[PDB]
Each structure stands twice: as structure tokens, then as C-alpha cells.
Amino acid sequence: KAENTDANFYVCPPPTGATVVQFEQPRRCPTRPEGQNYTEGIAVVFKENIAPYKFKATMYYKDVTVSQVWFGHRYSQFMGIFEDRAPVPFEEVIDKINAKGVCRSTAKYVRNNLETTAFHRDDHETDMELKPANAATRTSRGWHTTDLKYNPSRVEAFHRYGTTVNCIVEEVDARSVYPYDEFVLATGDFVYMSPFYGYREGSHTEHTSYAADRFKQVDGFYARDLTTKARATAPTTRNLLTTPKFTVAWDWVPKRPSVCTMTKWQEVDEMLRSEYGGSFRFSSDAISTTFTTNLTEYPLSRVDLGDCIGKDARDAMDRIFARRYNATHIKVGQPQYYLANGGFLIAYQPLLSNTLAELYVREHLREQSVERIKTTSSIEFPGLGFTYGHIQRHVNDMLGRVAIAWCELQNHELTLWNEARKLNPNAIASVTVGRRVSARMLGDVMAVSTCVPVAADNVIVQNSMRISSRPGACYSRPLVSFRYEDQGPLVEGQLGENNELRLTRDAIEPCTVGHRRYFTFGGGYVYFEEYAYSHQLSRADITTVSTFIDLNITMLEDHEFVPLEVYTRHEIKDSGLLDYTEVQRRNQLHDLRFADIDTVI
Amino acid sequence: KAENTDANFYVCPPPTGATVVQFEQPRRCPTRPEGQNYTEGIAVVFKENIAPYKFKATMYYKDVTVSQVWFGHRYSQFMGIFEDRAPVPFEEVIDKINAKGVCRSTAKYVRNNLETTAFHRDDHETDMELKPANAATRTSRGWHTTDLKYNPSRVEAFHRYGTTVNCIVEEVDARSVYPYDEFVLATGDFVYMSPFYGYREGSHTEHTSYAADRFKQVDGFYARDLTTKARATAPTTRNLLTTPKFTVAWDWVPKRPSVCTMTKWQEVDEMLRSEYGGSFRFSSDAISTTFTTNLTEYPLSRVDLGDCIGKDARDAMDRIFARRYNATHIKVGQPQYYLANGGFLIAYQPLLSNTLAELYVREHLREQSVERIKTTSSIEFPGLGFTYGHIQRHVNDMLGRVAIAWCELQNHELTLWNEARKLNPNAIASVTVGRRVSARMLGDVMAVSTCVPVAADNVIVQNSMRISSRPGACYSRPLVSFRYEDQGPLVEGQLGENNELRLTRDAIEPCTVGHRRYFTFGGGYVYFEEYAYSHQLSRADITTVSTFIDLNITMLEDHEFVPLEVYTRHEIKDSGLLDYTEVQRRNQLHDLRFADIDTVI
Amino acid sequence: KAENTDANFYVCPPPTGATVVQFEQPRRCPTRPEGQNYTEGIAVVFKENIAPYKFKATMYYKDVTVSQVWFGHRYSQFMGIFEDRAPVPFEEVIDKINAKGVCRSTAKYVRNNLETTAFHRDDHETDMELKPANAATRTSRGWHTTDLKYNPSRVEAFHRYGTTVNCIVEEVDARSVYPYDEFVLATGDFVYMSPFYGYREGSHTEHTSYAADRFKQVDGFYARDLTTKARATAPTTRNLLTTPKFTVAWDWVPKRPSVCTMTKWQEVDEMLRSEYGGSFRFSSDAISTTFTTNLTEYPLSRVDLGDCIGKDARDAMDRIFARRYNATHIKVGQPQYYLANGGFLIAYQPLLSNTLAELYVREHLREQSVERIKTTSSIEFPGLGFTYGHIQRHVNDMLGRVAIAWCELQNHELTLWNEARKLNPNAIASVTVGRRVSARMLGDVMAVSTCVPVAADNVIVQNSMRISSRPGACYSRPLVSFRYEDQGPLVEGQLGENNELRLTRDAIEPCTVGHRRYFTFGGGYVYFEEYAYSHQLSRADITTVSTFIDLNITMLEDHEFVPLEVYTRHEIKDSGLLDYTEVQRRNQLHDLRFADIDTVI
């Protein structure tokens, strides 16, 4: 019997030829795709402009205080203070200040539908000098005639008034937003006129909310710098609006050049555009993002106040070609404007290498074939897509190759399986149908028929290989006997390879000197020597070597991506030093907290 | 000797059988995983609502100015102006304005704990018409009785007063935020009462900061549209609060339906939920994001003011099933509410295809088994995860297959290595232990023993293949001699394949007509013809063909992802036209820059 | 002829040896890279601090109203109201309030360069108690002496004045921002002095905009809590500034400890740093991001007001090592400060496992070898990179292995192709040059020459395999005849494998009992039996089995990533309850809409 039992035994009566099989012919090998095709190009990306129009301006006004004081024993108490900003007449600004840097000590102005007027100190008019405002960090420039408050001189038990008239001139930045038909200052003072209003060009159509005479425009003007007392070298066109409280002056410039609904966001040297099922796809190596567009360009006409765009994109695409392509490529058609999801305007100039110059004609043809645009705040998804495509591309290429390389090999080896099939039809067959079988070749095809199992506790090997029947020669393979069923009548046979029990004992070789062999037998072997038995063996007790070329794949583990913000939207909010809402709220609770708004006395 | 030296020589005395080896049996092939399992479902995603409650309102008030003017030679100067908004009595609004669109030319009100009163022009009471405010772009509607300022008539050297009383009515939008117990206007005016205060329902418990009589509620009210002079068709419940400065009117509505702590963010047709180690995972193809939850639903109870959620999610999930599933699937249980990291509430309806209807019973069971929620600002990580999983999944699948396909092949080919082993035990062996060796088969296993190296500058081939010893036949393989060591005694042998030096010269074939052969010999060959020598050869000088199926892997290069923002947080800030902080800062520096706050006179 | 035509016929006259070929020797197998190398380490990430300095403060002031009323028949009308906040003298706050929680019913102060003064009710001075402000939700604490407005008693036709003097004390939060040289309150009131001004330490150099006597500092002060009337247990250094309108008090603390330009953003247990072409790369498993730095550390010196950084990072890195490494590793050098793109300061402590302790000496050496930093708002790209690298790494590893495993196999199998080549030189050859050819072995190389095509409509098989010429034996392969060209003279031959037409009919086997075979013949077979014809066959009509190990690669589909925001930048804006710009705009339009700013009367 068999020490080792980790195995099975079969009997393989040659197939008649009732069952035949053929080998699958070489399959059609997959073909590498002609390719996903790109278009070299330069690009300039445009985000909706969210910056206000910014420009310096200068105000001139006069703060007028009128106080009344009661005079008594020991003390003086204010009975009332009336403050006010008075706007400066056009002529004064010119003929005084920009003339001689001085101001009247009298304010004459309209207030509440009466022409009021005010004398500093109530003394008669005096031109006073303009001396700078007291020093303040992070302020533009101011100037002021006085810095004291004139109160009525003390006469007992007799109330009276003091007019003081401080002439104030400030330089202030001025901001405004689309559609640029009014602007504001740094004082909080609104001014309800376009910044580009005027007489010159079409400006007159620009918006105004004021009476016609509150605006002047000294064409050809020269500024006298209050501090330096230097006149202006080059003349401006100077705008001057007199609102109920002040006069603001500034230089006029044309609208169209001065503003734009969009901003040049990013400049891309190499911007590769593809078309992915009728949608366009520009991706940058640098910015690592990838945008998606329609196959039609976008009409700048439809863009209100988009002058800069053309001017800006062009200026940069040309600057780029010089630094990097003066030898290198060819401009296929004029620049083209696309609008990627997320509302990012895209200026693209399709290119074409130098060496391969011949194709201008080809693509040029293809390269030839209002409102407010909003831009998302996040470049996230363009990044994702970029990242996903590149990895997708690569992976899908390589594995694709592995597919074919594989197939090429499957078809290759058939040439061996053929010849191998002729050598051991038994084994080759059984490895091909994943079960043990008997087999035979009928010319070009394989006759096969099944193989019968035999209980491993039913197999018996005979001790010698020497043949009493005919001496000199020996059975080349050990002798055995076995039963199919337990109580079944014993059968006689010769051992084969892989526990194949051959019924006929014909496998014979001449007795050679010092013969010593091992044979597959159950879960292990059995050893022989000089044609006589010795012992069995564990498969383990013999040096094992492998035909298997190793490769171990490991999985790429799951990862978890907990959401994480750099700054929480409130953190940002809280960077607001003063909170307007918080203050008005607080301010407007005062009476409710500290006095009585109900009780009539 | 040998022209070509890029090689080595060995001598392979047949192994006795001291060393034996076996072939590694077929390994256990990896098994494809039963799979990661999804659950079809529809979904509606909810971000924390950050919008204030918005609603129209109408104010009615009266600006009262009282000026005093001094009369002198040549001029008039204001000695003081006192402005004020006076709130309108409940009855006036009703019995005048909403009655007949007119207003008294007198204001009677409480101010500073005295019932002051004011006569426009000081002439006695007059009802005056309500004429629209002068035109202003981007304003709601106003109306006003007068538009002039009445100043006291000129009498010389005699001061006096003018009461003017402008009746003003405005429609204004009104905003408020959680917890909705006070609201504000577009005038900046705070009103410290819930918007949902009233007598009806439980509203009375809503917050108030005012005396009880400053509120009225004309149940069943009809608005008379000041401009059109058309009465209101359907009645409202109308709220009217009289703050110290004005009366604001609006229609009352119930709270619960009127507001929600959350907003319906996104509607997802196909939302696939998985469970990944006891955590849930819903991912959308469309939005390309993937969220992570606990395995337990979220109790809407815990959500304060979350009425809409249920109402909204339900409304859409049902609308969806119609457009896309009226034939297609089956609702497993009622909708379920999950809360993904990032605080995104998720309404999910687990589904199940039509064809496979049989499983309701199975999952339904499983589908059965306060506070303020904050939502992050960025959908970044849900996107990342989404992107990572999908690529992970795919890759890990394919390579997984490559692993098995490979293994299947390693086990396959052993069937050839077997039969091949019997044919050239020498070569097969040496390729299996990665070093040259001699070998032999002892039945089912391989007897092996080593092979000895011989200096390439020590090998000598004999010129003829014809045998003086026995003529007619020829050595089938060229004759050689060689020494092991330099000064070692020469040895005689016959050449084999791959520079194998056979000690016995027994390899013999009959001299055939016009014989011509090449033999492996050193870094190249040596050519023969008619059994006599001719010359050697470079391996290179002969047409080479390959058995190698090609595949070339390329690496996917590193990429760098420079951080890039669309808009810098300051860019956003700067989109604030007026900056409150900048202005108050500037405003509150005035005195410090332009006057003196120290010097007592 | 041949029923099946899906095939071709060839004739293969043995090559003379004019054309010979060799097999490509084993190629050099790729070598796995020694590896990308990491450095274990702990980390703490720092975002630019955007929070203002926050600290409690307490103001003390006095609102002074002076009203005049006209007395007439039936009524009283205000002729004017003058309101004002008056600042409290240093002594009062101390010697009254913090002493005895009471206040004078008189205000004495400087206003407009006159020392005005005010008597509550005009009755003489009275100390009055400080009673809390009326209750208001979400306010800090106030207190006030009175809550009524005193108006002049009614005498007919005689105007007069009422001075009322409400003493108010508030606790208010106070905020300020870099460079911390002035701060603000919750009242909107600016205070133009550093919060850290004082006499102690170097503070005196801190900024001031006020006269020197408006500041006091009671070193060693004890607060009396107005409500509880409990004195303060521990003494403060108390700052008190008297601005023109109020006095604000607060405790002084040193600057350096009290503020920091940066904030501890994130704490990373395992932070792996690599160097990628001379740029550093720290990536976290947890936060799933990966940052990029230069190979040089960053000098904290260059960081203005960065005291906390050192203090904070150190404190946490040490806390971490305890929880997780008290046994585990070794601190290679002191902490190191790097600044990753996006301006994220990085505190890193390079570590080294315990078991492998021997390398301190090695890396320690390497670990040894002002301004305002801005931090981007988005952690996007660090995430991308993180995600991309990890997938890149993995993929590039595995496929890399597949490359080698493959190559190892290509070189392996040559050992079979060799022996196989000797068995069927015909077939092996033709599969190696991808076209049918005749072949032969000249020792160690392959003699080859071409094979000739023959029209499939030109091949004829002869019916018996029995040989009239010599009986007993049979042609082992069916007999045929064929022409090369149509009208060409017929040729005689024997069939071979794969439609090989052998010109000589020498393939012969003894007639065996009950012979039955199939032969490859055109697009199918032809069957034989007992050496006589029977019929042909379709390839399809026979059981086919495959030698091909299957593997199917599928592509990972394109995905589209539509841009998607959680909250649109305006949605955020609109979360601003009151909009300052909207209000001032609206407020400053008033006159334009409701009165006349032109018409002089």
C-alpha cells in the first residue's frame, strides 16, 4: 500500500475514438487604437472680473459748525451744536485753490431750500492758507485752513452763537462697480454719477442723478499740488461735481479702455486641446487642470465691456511665441475664444510644429469652421478631470498592451502544445479539459475517452522489476495490482506516470547495472534500486524546484478622505474687524436697554 | 581556438543520482472576489441654509425738520437744524392712507418722554396727497406728501423757526436670520420683533422687545395700492409695529412652513450606496462626488425647523421615479435620512429592479433596521474619494485578473516542461536552477549533478568529421580537445550543444552528400562543409529571429500640482464696493487730523 | 476537392540552407528599483492667522441730551435736540464707580475747544446709583443711572432747555488686527492706540494718536463688579484711555505672548517626508494631502510675531510621542520648520524606529545640514498630488513587476522552443516569422526557405490508403494531386499536417485493423476509415477545446466632471443680514428721491 495518501489513482483504457476534440485555433488579436489626438496650442484664461473700477479723486468741502453756549455762574454749557459740510463753488476751487492754494473763511451754500451762508468767526471774509491735515497713518492727503472751534465769548446770563468755517480738501480713492453709473469714495460718500460722464465723446449719455449745473468740466486743466506747490506738467480733462455736501474733482478718461467685465487669469504656454465626443478639452500640464467646452467658439460681441480680452490675450500669445517658438511652430488661423464650463473664457491659438509645416491648409479650414459671464469660485473639477484623464489614459494604455501581448502569446504557444500533444497525449489532454482522461491521436485530432478512479486504499505494488517470465530484461515500470471496488476482484497492472495504472504489463527495459529510480505513487513516491524494492517517500522529502515564473499582485488599499477646510466660512467672516451688522444691531438697541421709549411725562 | 569569446565552456559528467529534484506542483490559483456590492437609489442632498428669511414690508413714517435761521444784512444763516423721523399712528395708516392715500400735514408723536407735535408750515392740519418719490434706479417704491423745505420768512435781526412735515411711505424688502426673533430692513433700521409674531396660532410666544400697544394686527385686511389706487382682491393678516421712529407693516404668515434650517442642494437620479466596513458610501456618477456616513439614519426631529426637508425630498423622489422608473424598479421601504461628513443631509430611497422583483421582503427589513447642522464649504474630498475609489476599483480588478490569468498559465505550461524535460534534461534542468548543470531522469524525478567550467582560451576543435577509425560514418558533432587548467594535461572530447564538451566521442552519423552545418562555439559559431572545417562566425553575422512576444511598460511620470486659486480671499473682499471698516476708521480719524481735541480756550 | 474553403495549401521543398536563422538569446531582464525612500515624522501645520486679537474691555461714558421745546395752545413741539457722549474723568471711574458703584449727575467735559458742563435736570450734583441696563439678548453688560428724559416744564409761549445726564457703563468685546496699533469695539467706536500700550516693558513704544494725559495706568488694580459688588481677588494692570467721547478701560498684557501671525492648523501623527528631485514632499495618510517644499528649512526669525509657533509645535510633538512612541522611535535632531507652497508652515520632527536604533549618527547630520506669510484658501492641489502620487506609485510598481515577470517568462520558454524546434522545424519556423515556410536544422541553427501557395480550388485527394505497389502497409497520410496554376500540369503528392503538400509519397504505416482518422484539409477536415475514404467535415462539427488561458481587459471609461460648488460666492455674500453698501447707497439717495436739493426759495 501507499504511505502517502494525498493523491488519487486512475485507469486509462485507450479511447476507441468515440470522443474526439480539436484545439481552438489562434484567436484574432486586439488592435492598438490609432490614438487619442491632441492639438498643440497657447492659451490665456479669463475669470469674470470682480474688482471695482478704482481711481483717485479729490474732494473739496467745508465743515461748518454753529454752537450755542449758555453762560452761568462757574460754567458754560452747550445748548446746541449744528454741524454741516458745505460744498465748494466751482469758481473757488479754480480761482482760489488750484490758483493760489487758499480758501475763503466764509461758506455760502444752499441748504434745505434756502441759500444759507457762514462767516468763520463771523469776522468778514478772509482768504486763509491751506495747511496739511495732522499726520495720520494710512490716509491719503488732506489739508485744512483752521483747526480750532470758535465759541461765542462769555457774557453772563446771555446765550449766543459761534460760526466757525473749516475749509477741507481731501484726496480720496474712488471705487465703483458695473454698470459704472455711480461711484463712491473712502468717506462712504456716494456720488450718483458715472465716473466716465462728460461732454467729450459719447460720455454725455452716461448716467447722472443731479441738476445740470452741478457739473463742470474744465477741458485742458493743470493741477497745482497743494503741498509741493508745483503746477501739473501735462493737462487733464477735469471733472467737478457739486453734490449738496461737497465738490469732488477728478480727471476724465474714456470708458471702454478704462474697464473690463473680465480678468486675464492665467497664461498657458502649452495648452492641449482635444475633442472628446464633440466636446472640447483643453488641459494644462502646469496648472494641472482640464476644461470642457463646446465645439463652437464664443462671440466677444456677446461680452459687454470686453475690450481688454482681445487686447490682452493677443498681447500675451505673441509675447509667448517669441520666447519659445520663434523657430518652433506655425499659427493655424487667428486666435479663438472658447467658454469652458465654470464660465472661464479661453483664448486659444492652435499651433503646428515646424518640421511638419505641410498641414496649415488642412486645419486652417477647421480653425475657421450682450451679457455678463459668471465664473465659479473653484477650479476643483477641472483639476479632478485633469487628474483622472491622465491616469485613465495611462492605465488604459498599458493594460491594453498587456491584453494583446497576452493574446499574442496564447496564439504563439499553440505551436508547442501541438507537438507536446503528440508526445504525451494522456497528460496534455487531461490538462486541457481540467480532468483526467485517456486519449489518442487520429491523425490531426484527438481521440479521447474517460479514465476511471480507484480507491487509494486499494493499490498494491509488486517488489521486483526482474522478470521470471523472460530474464535479462526488466519491466521499465513497477508492477501493481488493485481492485476497483473493495470487495471487487483484484486486477493486475503496471504503474505509469502520475498514478496511471496500465492494465498490460509491457513497459520493459534491459536490466542495467546499478539501477535506482523513484516513482510517483500516492501523495508521494516509492524508491527502487537494482530492480528490487526499498521504500516509499514523502513528496516533501525531496528537493523541489519550480518552473513557475513568479509575480505577486497586491491591492491598492481603500483610503478615506475626511473633509477638511483650511478656513471655515465663519473664520473668514470673523476676519472682518468691525462687523457692521453686529454694530447697527447693538447701536439700535440702545434706547431699549438704557432709557424709556414708552412713558409720557 | 575561438574567434568569438563572449561565452563559456562546460563539461557535464552525468549525475550519478546523488542529487535529485522535483518540480513544484501547480499552485492554488487565486479566486476572484464575490464582489463589492451596491444599492441602487435616488437621492437629494441638503446643505445648511445660509440665506436669511426674505419678505416684502412697507414702512410709513414722517421726517420732521425744524430749522432756525438768523436774518442779517445781505444774508441768512442757519443757526440750527433738527431732523427727525416720526412714527405714524395705527389709525392714520388705516383710516387715511389705506383708506384714501393721503396724510396729515401734522406729526404727533412721543420723543424723549414728551409728546411733541409738529405742524407742516405751522399752518393747521391738512390732509395732503401721497405722490411717488422722485425716480431712482434700483429702489422699491416710495411716496411723499411734499418735497420742499419751509424756512421762517425773513424779518431782519429776528431769529425764528420753521416746522416742515414730510410724510413718507416706503416699500422695503425685509431680511432676518435664525432664530428669527427680530428682523431688519433695507434702510438699516432694526426691528426687534420676530417676523412671525401675532395673535393667531402659537405666534404670540414669538419674541418682542416693545411695549404691547406698539403692535396691531388687522385680521382680514385689504391693501390699497398707493400708485394704482386698486384695492387688494384677497385679504391678508396684516402686522403693524410702531417703533419710536416709524411704523412697519407686513402680512403675517406661519413660521414652520415659512422657513427651513437647510436647503435642497442637489438632486441625484442614480445614487449608489455601499457599505465599506460599517460606514456607508453614496456616490454619484453625475456630480462625481462620494460621501461617507454611519450605518444609522438621522432623526429629523433633531433638526430644528426642518419642515421643508421632508416635504422637499419626498416631492422630488416621487417626481423622479415617474420620469425614469414608472416601469423600472421597486421602492424598498420609505425614504431614509443620512448625514454625511461635511454635514450634508441625504435623503435616499433604496430601489430594486423590476425583473428581479422577488427581494422586497429581504431588504425592506434591513431598510427598517434639537440642533443646527453645519455644512462645510467644499465638496473637495467627496470628489477625491469618488475619483480615487473608481480608479482603485478598476485597477485592482484588472491586475487582480492578470494575477490569476498568470497563475493559470504557470500551472498550465508545467505539462510541457514535463515532456520537454525528458527530451533535453541537460538544458531544461539548467534553466530551472539558473546555472549550468548535468542531469538525468530516474523515472519521475530528476537526477542532477554539477557542470565544470573550462577557460575559453583553452578549447580546440579538430578539423574533420570523417572517421579514420571506422569509415563511411562521421561524428555527428565536431571533435575537440581542451585542458581544465592552463598547464593541465590536455583532454579529448566531442562538442555538444551550447558549448557542452562531451568526454566520449560517440555522436555519429553516416557521411551524407553535401553536408554543411553550423555549431555553437564561444561567443559565436563555427561553420562546416562536406565534413571538413571552413571557418568560425560572429553570432551577429546571421539572421536572428525572436521567440519573444513583445510588451513594453512605460512609467506614468511624476506630476507637480502647484496650488492655484481662482480668486484670492482678498480679491473677494475687495469686491466689497464700500468697505465699512475702512470708512468708519477713516471717518473716526477726522478730528485727530483736522482740528484740536485738546486745547481748551 | 474540398467542401471547406476557409483555408490555404502550401508546398514545402526543404531548404537547401541558403537561408538560415537563429533565435534571439535571452534579453536582459529589467531590474526592480532600489526604491523611493520615506522619512517617518510628526508634523504640525500652520495657516496664516486671520483672526483679530480679541479681548474684553469696559467703557464708561455719559450721554448728554439738551432739548428745547416750544409751549403753545394745545401742544408742545421740540425746537431742537442736542445729544452727546461725554467721556468720564479718570478719577471718577476710580474714586466713584470702582469705589462705590455710583456716578455724578453732572458731566464736565471738553467739547469743540470749550470746557462745557452739564447738570442732570440742572439740579445740582448728585451721586446716583448704577443700575443695570434693561435686559437685552446677546449683549454684554451695561449699567445706567437714569432712564428718563427731562424736558423743561411747561410755561406758555416761553421756550427753554432741559439738561439730562445719563451715566452709562458698558462691558464690550474689543477687536484689533495686525499690526495691532489701534483697536475697535462692538459699538463701532475706534480707539487709535495699540491694545498693548503702557509704561511697563517696552510697551511705551506702542502706538498712540492721543495727547499724553488721556491715558492712565493704575498699576496694581482691583475691579469692583458693578452687579455682584464683589471686589477683584487678583490685581491687574489696568489701562484707561479717555477719548473725546468716552473712557475705555482694560487690563494690560504683553504683546509677544498675546498674539501670533499664524495659527496651528493641523496636527499630524505620521507625516512622511520624501525628497523628489531636490524638493521635499510631506504627505499625510489622515488629511490625505501632500505638500511641497524646498530642501532648506525656514527661519522663524523672518516671521514677525511668531512666538506661538515654536511654543505650540513643540508642545504637541512631545505630547504625541508619549501617546504613541514612548517605546517606538528616536528623535533625529531638533524640530525643523518648512514652508510648503500655499504658505503652510510645517513643523516636522524626523524620527527613526526603535529596533533600528543605529542610525541617529547618520541622519542627525543631515537633519542639521521679518515678514508676513500668506496662506491660500484651498487645500485642493495638496490633495490632488496626494491622490495622484499614491495611485501613480502603486500602478507604476505592479505594471513594473508585470514587465519583469513577463520578461522572465519570455527567456524561460526559449528552452522549450528549442526542443520543439527540433521536433517540427516546419511549424515552429513559420510561427516565428509569421508566414508559412519550409525549414531544417543545420546543427545549431535553422536552415529555412520559402513555401509555395496553391489554389484551394486545385487540390485532389486519392481515395484509398492501401498500396497496390507494396501491399500490407499503407501511406500514413492521404494521397493527393494538385496543380500550381489552373491550366498548369497536375502534380502528384501526399498530404501533410496543416495542408502541407508533400511531393514524395513516403509516409507509410502498416495496415492496422479498424483504422479511422481525420485530416486537416481546407477550411475543415476529411474523415477516413479502414484505409478507405468516407467524407469531409466542417471544423465546426467537432468538439473544440482550448489551450488558451483566458484574460479579458476592460477599459476604464471616460468620466465627466461638471463643475459644482456648494455655495456660490453670492450665496455667501447674501448671508450678510444687513448689507452696508446696499444701505448707505439707499440712505444717501433720500433727498434725491423725496425732496429738492436745487430750488432756492
Ligand SMILES: *[C@@H]1O[C@H](CO)[C@@H](O[C@@H]2O[C@H](CO)[C@@H](O)[C@H](O)[C@H]2NC(C)=O)[C@H](O)[C@H]1NC(C)=O
Ligand atoms: C454648449 O452648447 C450646448 C448646446 O449646444 C449648451 O447646452 C445647454 O446648456 C445649458 C446651460 O446653459 C443647459 O441648461 C442645457 O440643458 C444645455 N442643453 C443641452 C440639451 O445640453 C451649452 O449652454 C453650451 N455651453 C456653454 C458653456 O455655453
Ligand SMILES: *[C@@H]1O[C@H](CO)[C@@H](O[C@@H]2O[C@H](CO)[C@@H](O)[C@H](O)[C@H]2NC(C)=O)[C@H](O)[C@H]1NC(C)=O
Ligand atoms: C457616526 O457615528 C459615530 C459613532 O457611531 C460618531 O463618531 C464620532 O464623531 C465625532 C464627531 O462628531 C468624533 O469627534 C468622535 O471622535 C467620533 N467617535 C468615534 C470613536 O469615532 C459620529 O459622530 C457619527 N457621524 C456623524 C456625521 O454624525
Ligand SMILES: *[C@@H]1O[C@H](CO)[C@@H](O[C@@H]2O[C@H](CO)[C@@H](O)[C@H](O)[C@H]2NC(C)=O)[C@H](O)[C@H]1NC(C)=O
Ligand atoms: C524655494 O526656493 C526656491 C529657490 O531656491 C524659490 O524659487 C522661487 O520662488 C519664487 C516665488 O516666491 C518664484 O517666483 C521664482 O521664480 C522662484 N525661482 C526659481 C528660479 O525657481 C522659492 O521661493 C522657495 N519656495 C518658498 C515657498 O519659499
Ligand SMILES: *[C@@H]1O[C@H](CO)[C@@H](O)[C@H](O)[C@H]1NC(C)=O
Ligand atoms: C528666439 O529663440 C531663441 C531660442 O533660444 C531665443 O534665444 C530668443 O530669445 C528668441 N528671439 C525671438 C525672436 O524672440
Ligand SMILES: *[C@@H]1O[C@H](CO)[C@@H](O)[C@H](O)[C@H]1NC(C)=O
Ligand atoms: C412612464 O415612462 C415612459 C418611458 O418612456 C415615459 O414616456 C412617461 O413619461 C412615464 N410616465 C409616467 C407614468 O410618469
Ligand SMILES: *[C@@H]1O[C@H](CO)[C@@H](O)[C@H](O)[C@H]1NC(C)=O
Ligand atoms: C506609553 O505607551 C503605552 C502604550 O500602550 C501607553 O499605555 C502609555 O500611555 C504611554 N505612556 C507614556 C510614557 O506616555
Ligand SMILES: OC[C@@H](O)[C@@H](O)CO
Ligand atoms: O455709544 C453708543 C451709541 O452711540 C449707540 O448705542 C447709539 O445707537
Ligand SMILES: OC[C@@H](O)[C@@H](O)CO
Ligand atoms: O466728510 C467726512 C466726515 O463726514 C467724516 O470724516 C466724519 O467722521
Ligand SMILES: OC[C@@H](O)[C@@H](O)CO
Ligand atoms: O429713514 C431713512 C433715512 O434715515 C435715510 O434714507 C437717510 O439717508
Ligand SMILES: [Cl-]
Ligand atoms: Cl486630461
Ligand SMILES: [Cl-]
Ligand atoms: Cl466611489
Ligand SMILES: [Cl-]
Ligand atoms: Cl504622495
